[PDB]
Subunit: 92 residues, 2 copies
């Protein structure tokens, strides 16, 4: 089932970054930025979301806390959809 | 072909399939989200220390008929199902 394979892949990617060192259930925002930049390299903002995307990406880069858990990592993916997937171009 | 890219595109495709049925294409009802998780993640079941969190999660969707589940909340529900059902998180606090 396509959703099952997709959700298992999102956990695999998290394990790949969070398992590097330290607490296997957490990332630093620097690591989350590296993950999104490398793993979603081809994704770019839609027409009415460049500002929001840029602000989102700025916060990760400035922010150097290390309490990003799995749920927050998946919420970052959801946000990148809103910003970068055409389905949501007109979503309020 | 990057595995995360294909996965996140698939997550949006499944949302489109349910939310595009009728009404507002950006929202689901909790009844629709429970149908989605039951059909699309049919094989996933709770880990050793999460059965009661899982069951409570599933019972809230079934009781609560609110038609404000947006995309972000749908994805949060997938994340919660990971915490409950994927062995990687068996010991996560």
């Amino acid at each position: 089932r396509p959703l099952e394979q997709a959700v298992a892949a999102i956990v695999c990617t998290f394990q790949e970054y969070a398992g590097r060192c330290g607490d296997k259930y957490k990332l630093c925002q620097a690591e989350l930025k590296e993950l999104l930049q490398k793993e979603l390299a081809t994704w770019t903002p839609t027409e009415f979301r460049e500002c929001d995307y840029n602000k989102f990406m700025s916060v990760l880069d400035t922010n150097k806390d290390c309490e990003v858990d799995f749920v927050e990592y998946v919420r970052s993916l959801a946000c990148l959809c809103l910003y970068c997937h055409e389905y949501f171009k007109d979503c309020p």
